[PDB]
Amino acid sequence: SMHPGHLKGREIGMWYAKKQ
SS3 of residue 18 by DSSP: coil
Q: How far is CA 10 from the centre of its chain?
A: 8
Q: How far is CA 14 from CA 2, 3, 5, in A?
A: 16, 14, 13
- Give the list of residues 6+ apart from residue 1 with CB closer than 8 angstroms, or none: none
Question: Determination technique for this PDB entry?
Answer: NMR
20 vs 15: CA distance, rounded Å: 9
Closest CA to 16 of 7, 6, 2, 1: 7
Residue type, 4: P
Contact 17, 9 (CB under 8 A): no
Backbone phi and psi for residue 16, each to the nearest 5 degrees, phi listed first: -50, -55
Which H/E stretch holds residue 20? none
